[PDB]
Amino acid sequence: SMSYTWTGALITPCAAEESKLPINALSNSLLRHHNMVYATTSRSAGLRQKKVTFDRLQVLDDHYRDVLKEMKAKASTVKAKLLSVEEACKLTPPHSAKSKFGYGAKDVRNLSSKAVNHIHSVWKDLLEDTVTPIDTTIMAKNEVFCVQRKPARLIVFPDLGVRVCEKMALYDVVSTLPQVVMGSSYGFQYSPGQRVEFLVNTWKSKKNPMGFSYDTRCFDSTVTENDIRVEESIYQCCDLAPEARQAIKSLTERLYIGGPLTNSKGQNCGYRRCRASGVLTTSCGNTLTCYLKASAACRAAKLQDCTMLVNGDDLVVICESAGTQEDAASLRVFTEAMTRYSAPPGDPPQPEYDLELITSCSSNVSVAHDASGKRVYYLTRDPTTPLARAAWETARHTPVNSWLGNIIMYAPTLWARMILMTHFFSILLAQEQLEKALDCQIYGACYSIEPLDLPQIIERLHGLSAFSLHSYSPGEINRVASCLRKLGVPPLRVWRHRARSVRARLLSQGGRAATCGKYLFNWAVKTKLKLTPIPAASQLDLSGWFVAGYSGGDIYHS
Ligand SMILES: O=C(O)[C@H](Cc1ccccc1)N(Cc1cccc(C(F)(F)F)c1)C(=O)c1ccc(Cl)cc1Cl
């Protein structure tokens, strides 16, 4: 079956779109090569349509059915509850797309009678009808990148009412089931630090380690009807309320498997027969399907002691080496099996014998040293995209503040500490907006975070060592330095000069701002300070942060 069939109608914009980096008076302090940054827009949607439209074939062998039976055995130990309407409503982003039925995201969060009444009629319809295709809107994502130009990604999502219904029926399932079925291989259960720890321990557990990242080409498009019905059979293994079983069956038949695509102008754009990128189950469905195909492919390839780390379509495997030559051969067979399972590769997989050289979830393990002088492994990444998006956010307020999200996920890195923290705290000072909560995302879920809570939040997730790492690796230092040049960003020596100023300024404010100056920029002074556990860090309720992935899932954790 074709992943998509098209009518010719265009994927249309929902408002004005900007592709060129907006420039203000602050832009140059961060980046000078403005032409390197761009945002994707609907004008490239047609190009994306061509890459994502292809036929899918599947050859399912005994290794595939063996792994699935095992997955189903673990799934049968899961007991999940139906969420109430109020709970589901409270999980809805404040600015989530409004319903076509006369109410918006605020109406839902306030439990307005119109929204709640319509939500109840959608739920009832799900229970009575298990066949009628549910409508979806298809949009082109406006996302920022650096050159080396890619076309806009596509986002397909059902109406707001249906989304609240997905939450009622499946939020508990998608939040609980993956870790049970996949154990330690489920990546979304890990904070950046725990991820590193799982990777380092998994690597150290092999006599002769070897690992590779496996990039699937347009994964959502490779997901077949079979795949989606198999995912549902796994959900159905759970101990669930009868109403939840019916809604899951209905949602699978009417929405997950396929459905008509409508543009922002209300025209039919065509029909989808693959994974929708904008539904509650996108992350969980992709993770389970990637793990099932890969686990089975590991068996077919005769990979020795293969350990998976899977986050949606992002896949990394660490196993026992059989020698340089044999490895190359096994990987080839692994890739052939995945292809048979409808998970063909984009970039061909290549074995790596150096853990730090493996990139998964666009990140890699690197090493530095803490106060004591001890080696500490931490998660970093190429800062090109973080900086391109930071440049955009320097001149444009956007719904998701990636700079904040990146400071939280990459607080221990050289680049997040010296550039992002310095740059944005300088702006918050100047605009006196330090206590203004801002929306950012972690594993797809949206959170309102106050920048003044950063010190505590970081202590909680990375430990106090995040404020004292040093002696980064020549490789890391050099990648950052080279990145600054490609983008036209001031050299690290300049950010250090700046950080000294930002730090003195925060300190002058006292209170929380002073804590920020003290912990976040202790690295900027030749005579470092104390830095002891922050009493308020234990107060923060970080339960739910690193539990599951919700990318495209319309999730908000207030
Ligand atoms: O330890 C390191 O790896 C860097 C190495 C480095 C190399 C090139 C550019 C920036 C850092 N330096 C050593 C260092 C400190 C101050 C000034 C320099 C200079 F002059 F070389 F840029 C280097 C630091 O003291 C340092 C440590 C943590 C953080 Cl968050 C920031 C800094 Cl600056």
Side-chain angles (χ1 to χ4, degrees):
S1 52
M2 288 300 286
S3 51
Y4 294 101
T5 57
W6 302 107
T7 62
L10 310 171
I11 294 182
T12 49
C14 196
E17 301 171 300
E18 297 189 88
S19 60
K20 51 181 195 288
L21 181 70
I23 297 302
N24 62 357
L26 303 176
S27 303
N28 293 317
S29 60
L30 179 66
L31 170 165
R32 284 174 169 287
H33 300 167
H34 310 149
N35 281 356
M36 303 269 289
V37 184
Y38 70 99
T40 58
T41 72
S42 54
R43 290 195 288 292
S44 67
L47 288 180
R48 177 60 67 182
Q49 286 175 77
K50 293 188 167 57
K51 306 178 186 300
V52 305
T53 307
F54 48 79
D55 182 46
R56 284 81 51 76
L57 252 49
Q58 280 185 308
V59 172
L60 304 185
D61 69 340
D62 294 298
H63 288 316
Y64 176 94
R65 289 180 289 287
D66 281 352
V67 168
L68 174 65
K69 179 165 184 170
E70 293 171 33
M71 284 171 78
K72 287 187 180 178
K74 297 176 177 71
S76 80
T77 67
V78 170
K79 174 175 191 176
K81 64 159 173 287
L82 204 48
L83 245 52
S84 61
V85 165
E86 34 264 72
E87 284 175 310
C89 289
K90 301 310 175 170
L91 280 164
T92 304
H95 300 75
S96 191
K98 58 176 184 164
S99 175
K100 291 184 180 170
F101 300 99
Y103 66 95
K106 297 317 306 173
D107 294 319
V108 163
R109 297 184 57 74
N110 285 328
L111 310 179
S112 86
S113 66
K114 193 180 178 63
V116 177
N117 272 358
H118 174 256
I119 285 156
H120 275 292
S121 72
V122 177
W123 183 258
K124 179 177 174 173
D125 177 76
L126 285 170
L127 297 182
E128 324 219 66
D129 177 333
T130 61
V131 181
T132 316
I134 283 170
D135 176 60
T136 62
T137 299
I138 180 168
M139 297 287 212
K141 302 195 176 180
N142 296 143
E143 286 178 304
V144 170
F145 297 103
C146 180
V147 288
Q148 171 99 300
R149 294 183 54 171
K150 65 183 68 185
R153 289 198 297 170
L154 277 36
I155 184 75
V156 177
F157 62 102
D159 190 70
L160 171 54
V162 167
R163 291 198 308 277
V164 175
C165 286
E166 292 187 79
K167 293 170 161 63
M168 282 184 294
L170 279 151
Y171 184 74
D172 196 40
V173 169
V174 306
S175 298
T176 305
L177 183 171
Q179 186 283 323
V180 178
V181 167
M182 297 173 266
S184 59
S185 293
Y186 184 54
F188 293 128
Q189 72 188 292
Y190 302 125
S191 62
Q194 300 164 332
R195 191 186 165 84
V196 172
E197 177 168 61
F198 178 66
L199 288 168
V200 175
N201 290 345
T202 297
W203 190 261
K204 286 176 174 195
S205 77
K206 318 300 190 189
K207 299 182 185 69
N208 294 297
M210 176 290 260
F212 56 98
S213 54
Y214 184 83
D215 167 53
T216 301
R217 183 242 289 146
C218 299
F219 189 98
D220 293 353
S221 283
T222 72
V223 175
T224 61
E225 178 181 342
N226 167 83
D227 292 346
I228 292 167
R229 293 185 175 288
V230 163
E231 286 164 5
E232 196 226 324
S233 72
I234 294 166
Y235 304 144
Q236 293 300 349
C237 290
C238 294
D239 166 4
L240 306 169
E243 222 174 61
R245 293 188 180 286
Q246 180 66 350
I248 289 173
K249 177 180 186 301
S250 180
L251 280 167
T252 291
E253 298 284 347
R254 302 181 58 189
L255 172 75
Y256 301 152
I257 285 173
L261 303 157
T262 306
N263 68 11
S264 63
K265 293 181 179 170
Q267 302 166 295
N268 179 205
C269 278
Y271 206 78
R272 163 185 60 87
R273 295 188 200 71
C274 62
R275 173 82 68 209
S277 68
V279 293
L280 183 57
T281 50
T282 304
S283 178
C284 184
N286 280 349
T287 305
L288 286 163
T289 297
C290 190
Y291 173 97
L292 166 57
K293 296 185 183 182
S295 299
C298 151
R299 300 194 185 182
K302 302 157 295 177
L303 259 39
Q304 181 87 175
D305 198 17
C306 64
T307 298
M308 318 285 167
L309 178 55
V310 190
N311 296 56
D313 72 337
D314 193 286
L315 167 67
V316 121
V317 182
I318 303 306
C319 60
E320 203 55 79
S321 187
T324 17
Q325 290 284 44
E326 185 48 61
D327 288 345
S330 304
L331 243 187
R332 191 168 168 296
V333 176
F334 176 87
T335 305
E336 288 173 35
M338 291 290 275
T339 297
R340 285 195 299 266
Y341 301 150
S342 183
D347 297 306
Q350 81 155 294
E352 287 299 335
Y353 297 98
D354 185 331
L355 173 69
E356 293 184 52
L357 294 174
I358 299 174
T359 292
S360 56
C361 279
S362 301
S363 321
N364 64 270
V365 173
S366 193
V367 69
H369 300 266
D370 71 329
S372 308
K374 173 169 68 174
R375 275 164 63 82
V376 45
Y377 285 102
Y378 69 102
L379 198 71
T380 177
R381 64 161 292 160
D382 180 300
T384 297
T385 298
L387 297 174
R389 294 178 176 183
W392 193 284
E393 296 167 347
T394 289
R396 286 276 193 288
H397 294 105
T398 59
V400 186
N401 296 280
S402 77
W403 68 263
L404 183 51
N406 282 318
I407 291 182
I408 293 175
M409 300 294 289
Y410 297 105
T413 66
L414 187 53
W415 53 275
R417 299 165 82 194
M418 299 192 79
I419 308 188
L420 298 187
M421 290 183 191
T422 302
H423 183 70
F424 283 102
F425 269 86
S426 181
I427 294 175
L428 291 190
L429 278 160
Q431 300 303 306
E432 267 187 33
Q433 296 195 318
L434 277 52
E435 347 74 320
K436 181 182 176 180
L438 301 176
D439 294 335
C440 65
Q441 300 186 319
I442 298 172
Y443 289 161
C446 193
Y447 302 81
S448 167
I449 288 175
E450 305 199 317
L452 281 173
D453 285 322
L454 278 174
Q456 319 159 70
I457 291 180
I458 294 175
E459 178 177 347
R460 281 294 285 287
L461 308 172
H462 302 285
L464 297 176
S465 74
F467 311 123
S468 52
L469 300 190
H470 64 83
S471 289
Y472 291 87
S473 76
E476 179 57 18
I477 306 183
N478 266 283
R479 176 168 59 186
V480 176
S482 303
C483 177
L484 304 193
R485 289 193 299 274
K486 171 178 63 176
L487 268 42
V489 172
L492 294 180
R493 49 207 184 68
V494 173
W495 290 103
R496 182 180 175 281
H497 186 64
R498 288 181 189 168
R500 298 176 73 259
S501 168
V502 185
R503 168 178 158 51
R505 270 114 70 38
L506 287 166
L507 292 187
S508 287
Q509 299 287 294
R512 312 166 67 192
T515 306
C516 286
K518 181 172 191 298
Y519 291 70
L520 302 184
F521 300 104
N522 194 34
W523 56 273
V525 298
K526 42 178 183 172
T527 313
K528 273 69 174 190
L529 282 65
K530 53 196 299 177
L531 261 48
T532 60
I534 297 160
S538 63
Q539 291 182 181
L540 293 171
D541 184 294
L542 278 51
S543 55
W545 272 45
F546 296 102
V547 169
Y550 303 95
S551 182
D554 196 36
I555 299 300
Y556 179 83
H557 287 164
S558 61

Coordinates of all heavy atoms in Angstrom, one line a residue, residues 414 417-418 469-472 477 492-493 496 523, ligand 1:
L414 N 29.8 22.5 27.5 CA 30.5 23.7 27.4 C 29.7 24.8 26.7 O 29.7 25.9 27.2 CB 31.8 23.4 26.5 CG 32.8 24.6 26.4 CD1 33.2 25.0 27.8 CD2 34.0 24.1 25.6
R417 N 26.6 26.2 28.8 CA 27.0 27.0 29.9 C 27.6 28.4 29.4 O 27.2 29.4 30.0 CB 28.0 26.3 30.7 CG 27.5 25.0 31.4 CD 28.7 24.2 31.9 NE 29.1 24.6 33.2 CZ 30.3 24.3 33.8 NH1 31.1 23.4 33.2 NH2 30.5 24.7 35.0
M418 N 28.5 28.3 28.5 CA 29.1 29.5 28.0 C 28.3 30.4 27.1 O 28.5 31.6 27.1 CB 30.5 29.2 27.4 CG 31.5 28.5 28.3 SD 33.1 28.5 27.4 CE 33.6 30.1 27.8
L469 N 32.0 21.1 35.9 CA 32.7 20.3 34.9 C 33.7 21.2 34.2 O 33.5 22.4 34.1 CB 31.8 19.8 33.9 CG 30.7 18.8 34.4 CD1 30.0 18.2 33.2 CD2 31.2 17.8 35.3
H470 N 34.8 20.6 33.8 CA 35.9 21.3 33.1 C 36.8 20.3 32.4 O 36.6 19.1 32.7 CB 36.7 22.1 34.1 CG 37.4 21.3 35.2 ND1 38.6 20.7 35.0 CD2 37.0 21.0 36.4 CE1 39.0 20.1 36.0 NE2 38.0 20.2 36.9
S471 N 37.7 20.7 31.6 CA 38.6 19.8 30.9 C 37.9 19.0 30.0 O 38.0 17.8 29.9 CB 39.4 18.9 31.9 OG 40.4 19.7 32.7
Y472 N 37.0 19.6 29.2 CA 36.2 19.0 28.2 C 37.2 18.4 27.3 O 38.4 18.7 27.4 CB 35.3 20.0 27.5 CG 34.2 20.5 28.4 CD1 34.5 21.6 29.2 CD2 33.0 19.9 28.4 CE1 33.4 22.1 30.1 CE2 32.0 20.4 29.3 CZ 32.2 21.5 30.1 OH 31.2 21.9 30.9
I477 N 35.6 20.4 22.6 CA 36.0 21.8 22.5 C 36.2 22.1 21.0 O 35.6 23.2 20.6 CB 37.4 22.0 23.2 CG1 37.3 21.4 24.6 CG2 37.8 23.4 23.2 CD1 38.6 21.7 25.5
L492 N 34.5 31.5 22.2 CA 34.3 31.3 23.6 C 34.9 32.2 24.5 O 34.4 32.6 25.6 CB 34.7 29.8 23.9 CG 33.9 28.7 23.2 CD1 34.5 27.4 23.6 CD2 32.4 28.9 23.6
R493 N 36.1 32.7 24.2 CA 36.8 33.7 25.1 C 35.9 34.9 25.3 O 36.0 35.5 26.4 CB 38.2 34.0 24.5 CG 38.1 34.5 23.0 CD 39.4 34.2 22.3 NE 39.5 34.6 20.9 CZ 39.4 35.9 20.5 NH1 39.4 36.9 21.4 NH2 39.4 36.2 19.2
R496 N 33.1 34.1 27.8 CA 33.6 34.1 29.1 C 33.6 35.6 29.7 O 33.2 35.8 30.8 CB 35.0 33.5 29.2 CG 35.5 33.4 30.6 CD 36.9 32.8 30.7 NE 37.4 32.9 32.0 CZ 38.0 33.9 32.6 NH1 38.1 35.1 31.9 NH2 38.4 33.9 33.8
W523 N 31.8 29.1 36.8 CA 32.9 28.8 35.9 C 33.6 30.0 35.3 O 34.7 29.8 34.8 CB 32.4 27.9 34.7 CG 31.3 28.6 33.9 CD1 30.0 28.5 34.2 CD2 31.4 29.5 32.8 NE1 29.2 29.3 33.3 CE2 30.1 29.9 32.4 CE3 32.5 29.9 32.1 CZ2 29.9 30.7 31.3 CZ3 32.3 30.8 31.0 CH2 31.0 31.2 30.6
Ligands
LIG1 O1 38.3 23.5 30.9 C1 38.0 23.6 29.7 O2 37.8 22.6 29.0 C2 38.0 25.1 29.1 C3 38.8 25.1 27.7 C4 38.4 26.2 26.7 C5 39.1 26.3 25.5 C6 38.8 27.3 24.5 C7 37.7 28.2 24.8 C8 37.0 28.1 26.0 C9 37.3 27.1 27.0 N1 38.5 26.2 30.1 C10 39.9 26.8 29.8 C11 39.9 28.3 29.5 C12 39.4 29.3 30.4 C13 39.3 30.7 30.1 C14 39.9 31.2 28.9 C15 40.4 30.3 28.0 C16 40.9 30.8 26.6 F1 41.6 31.9 26.8 F2 41.8 29.9 26.1 F3 40.0 31.0 25.8 C17 40.4 28.9 28.3 C18 37.7 26.6 31.2 O3 38.2 27.0 32.2 C19 36.2 26.5 31.2 C20 35.6 25.4 31.9 C21 34.2 25.3 31.9 C22 33.4 26.2 31.3 CL1 31.7 26.1 31.4 C23 34.0 27.3 30.6 C24 35.4 27.5 30.6 CL2 36.1 28.8 29.7

